[PDB]
């Protein structure tokens, strides 16, 4: 009974109220908690030595961010019980000749691309320099949100609808050894390591700026719209393959199994395995 | 009130073995590293950004943050053995000894001894010596062995004394503005050890050395938890003495420091842990 809408379906009042709430959460000090949580989990390797971490590059990538978004939406509701977390359906923006012309980058919502005169500092929209302070990898101020759409040779474009459809065909949620090299794995496909960077990883590299590296990515509010779409694609996968379940169920690295606590919380993947039990739904499901 | 935390020197040889056993299990399962990471992450979480205050140190939440830290750690201990509690290292009595390194807490059956200067002060005795206990660095990667170097600093050659503890218990205010290292007439800042620092809590970290000598890696040494168990005991004694003093600030402090603000990286507030008896544990001196 909580509907999360496509960004392009939002009214100008819904767009304004969401932007308003994020700014309030930022002013109170709640927003920075989520930046720090995401950076801390990126450093928590499972197990130490491997390149698996609690939030990425392993089987917990999807449930971790679902819990991440769940906690964020609850904090949104503390200020306004009418604001939900919209999702950025970037696979349809990619259909455009110039995806940077999408209304999600308008001055009334997320703001536009970075200014190459000012080292790609974003100077338009509610999160422009002077209105929205960022923190660096070390937790100290860094002086402004940056973006540089499609300025990389490994991610010049946004993922397509065909990329999403081909990932939904995968039968297994994940496969051993539950990491960057997992083949025939929906998790690793959606994450974007199969001929990477694609999908989730490509979207981060396409936006650039803080969004292009793990420890600083949540500095951009579009991080939450991005992962709201990733969580939707996962929820669609769970509906299609109704008789598949999370993997691994056991004997994976600690923090990756079905009932292990996900650092930095005690929440397990099972606790968030059914998003309707969490109290929200995506508009395409109705 | 139904769970007693004993002085380390009062433990039986069976209690010492079970505690060491449980900690090793928590390390093997992967739970122990969660506390290293939690402590490092909170040390980087400045409140507010720019200021010299973090969620776990250098401000009013220092004491309740570590109490919740110890509470969560003790619960994980009970999941493996529902009869093991968190003992405390009463370092104010070890300081009375001429050489505190001769204390039974550093025996091969418990914490092990001082570092070996031949091996760059790697600890080579006890259950946590190199080869039986792997450590992680500030970045979350293995670092290859616990180090200790007792009293090797010019600013903290000795352990704090009994008189240091008594003089801290005299302070009337829990904390004072601006709720940080410069707070004067503050029990919290006094106990932390920034009044003519390093003293008390801060001095103990500097005296042990090794990983214990810097914030992000300190929990790599299991004595980190025994140390803070004693800090939590002294606070609980202060709360009993000054029964009508309360946490400060109650409001209009930096977010994360007020009585009902969530303490990163949890949602726990200082009020949630303000009464340690309600949390389910008690110190043996209270009996
Ligand atoms: O912040 C991130 C950036 C990238 C780019 O690969 O991937 C994953 C992230 O969480
Ligand atoms: O973990 C810590 C390490 C040091 C070293 O001085 O001081 C204070 C701490 O809380
Ligand atoms: Cu992430
Ligand atoms: Cu991401
Ligand atoms: Cu600490
Ligand atoms: Cu300490």
Numbering used by the authors:
A (entry chain A): 5 to 290
B (entry chain B): 4 to 290
Describing publication, verbatim:
Tyrosinases belong to the type 3 copper-containing protein family together with hemocynanins that serve as oxygen carriers, and catechol oxidases that are strict diphenolases34. The two copper ions in the conserved active site, CuA and CuB, are coordinated by six histidine residues567.
We present here the crystal structure of TyrBm with KA bound in the active site at 2.6 Å resolution. Here, by modifying our protocol for ligand binding in crystal, we have visualized the structure of TyrBm with KA bound in the active site similar to tyrosinase substrates. In the active site, KA is stabilized by π-π interactions with His208 that coordinates CuB, similar to tyrosinase substrates, as presented by Goldfeder et al. and suggested in other studies. These results are supported by a recent docking study of Lima et al., and contradict a previously proposed inhibition mechanism of KA by copper chelation. However, the two orientations of KA, which are demonstrated by crystallography and in silico simulations, support the mixed inhibition mechanism, which is confirmed by our kinetic experiments. We suggest that when KA is bound strongly in the active site, the binding pocket is not accessible to substrate molecules, subsequently TyrBm is not active. However, when KA is oriented at the entrance of the active site, it restricts substrate entrance and product efflux, consequently, TyrBm cannot reach its maximum velocity.
